[PDB]
């Protein structure tokens, strides 16, 4: 997954809980939702345990980068926590060889 709109978060959830569950590698650098998946995966503890400072920080970057409503930004943070929880299937291609 690269770049990717609001839809790719639910697509990551649909592929995270797949039959059987299958990995979702996300290449960062491009931006948009792949970068909030990456900025989760870097430092989100036990996946869905994004802490409170990140809560406000992630919700600022969602409500600013996606330009969506604040309720939708909180809701995509909850779907993000659902997807982030299974981060062992998530891999990030941090470019920079």
């Amino acid at each position: 997954i690269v770049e990717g709109g609001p839809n790719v978060i639910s697509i990551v959830l649909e592929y995270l809980r797949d039959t059987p569950p299958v990995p979702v590698v996300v290449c960062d650098g491009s931006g948009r939702a792949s970068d909030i998946l990456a900025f989760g995966h870097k430092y989100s503890e036990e996946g869905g345990l994004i802490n409170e400072s990140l809560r406000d920080q992630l919700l600022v970057t969602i409500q600013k980068t996606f330009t969506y409503t604040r309720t939708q930004a909180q809701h995509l943070f909850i779907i993000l926590m659902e997807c982030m929880k299974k981060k062992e299937l998530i891999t990030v291609f941090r470019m920079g060889h």
Partner: peptide, 26 residues
């Protein structure tokens, strides 16, 4: 210069994040 540019890129990333958060606060 390559390793010290890795300093400047990481440090300024915190500068861009703090400026964006201060814009939300004000």
């Amino acid at each position: 210069m390559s390793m010290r540019l890795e300093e400047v890129n990481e440090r300024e990333h915190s500068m861009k994040a703090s400026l964006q958060t201060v814009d939300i606060r004000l």
